[PDB]
Amino acid sequence: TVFRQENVDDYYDTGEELGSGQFAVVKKCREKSTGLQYAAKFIKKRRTKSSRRGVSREDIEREVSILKEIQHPNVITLHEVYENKTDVILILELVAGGELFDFLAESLTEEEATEFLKQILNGVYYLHSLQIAHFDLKPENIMLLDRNVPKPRIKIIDFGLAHKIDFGNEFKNIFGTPEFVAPEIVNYEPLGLEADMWSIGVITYILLSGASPFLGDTKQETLANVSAVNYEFEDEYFSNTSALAKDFIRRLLVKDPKKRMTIQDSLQHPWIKP
Ligand SMILES: O=c1cc(-c2ccc(O)c(O)c2)oc2cc(O)cc(O)c12
């Protein structure tokens, strides 16, 4: 699919930088015709077929196709797409409360954690209902609408690894952040919606304790820990945490994807179900 090739600067004014990554930068922007504000993610294109720099057309088009499908309070909304020779530019809904990652850097109670988790679960329920696996769930990829309220609302972002799972699994060598990836990703096995539920388990552990369950001193150690399900609930962190909360995590951090809680299971779990 081709995108709008008019100069984005003719329709938007950019401002504050909102984020930055390997082949992308995100800038706050304002549409001239409406005065409405957005986030513009500029994604560098591949300059040749066999280069490893920039993002392939295939990966870019997959991400745009998924973003065009989704409309839910807990997932980011895509407004427009532009492109030129160097970049594809996603004009995205503006979310101004920063990353959950940065909010966490400033441990929650179980209520505060479930407040966040319920919204993450609802957003993932929407995605999995459409057979969309996100494949990169982590606190950095959850944004807050406003971080100065008692119960911040959240939106899932960063669908750069997301895939439609129309055959129950995909076999693609998809691979996200070592701390959060499921064993099947570490082992290069076929992947499905189940991998997101493992990631939710890691996120939950972090929300409750401020600690990462599998994190080693090197990437290879972290990956080895993940594959071996090498984690435990340290008493220093979890002594005041309910056994039901631990049960929720335990049923997600399960190596066999078929035995892992599904998104529907997670919403019906006694720790979550009201
Ligand atoms: O960093 C941000 C990143 C993204 C984002 C959203 C969806 C994607 O598929 C993606 O690849 C990136 O959306 C935002 C939306 C915002 O309002 C503010 C932001 O910082 C971001």
Q: What is the CATH topology assignment of the largest domain?
A: Transferase(Phosphotransferase), domain 1
Biggest sheet: strand arrangement? 1-2-3-5-4
Radius of gyration: 19 Å
Content-based structural category: alpha+beta
Most strands sheet: 5 strands, antiparallel
**What is the count of helical runs?**
9
Number of domains: 2
PDB class: transferase
Keywords: death-associated protein kinase 1, serine/threonine protein kinase, natural flavonoid, transferase
Assembly: monomeric
Entry title: Crystal structure of DAPK1 in complex with luteolin.
Task: Provide structural commentary.
The strands form 3 sheets. The chain has a 5-stranded antiparallel β-sheet with strand order 1-2-3-5-4, with helices on one face. The longest helix has 20 residues, at 110-129. The N and C termini lie far apart (44 Å). It is an alpha+beta fold. Helix content is 31%, strand content 18%. The chain is built from 9 helices and 9 strands. The protein has 2 domains: 7-97, Phosphorylase Kinase, domain 1 (2-Layer Sandwich); 98-274, Transferase(Phosphotransferase), domain 1 (Orthogonal Bundle). The radius of gyration is 19 Å and the shape is globular. β4 (78-83) and β5 form a beta hairpin. The structure holds 2-(3,4-dihydroxyphenyl)-5,7-dihydroxy-4H-chromen-4-one (LU2).
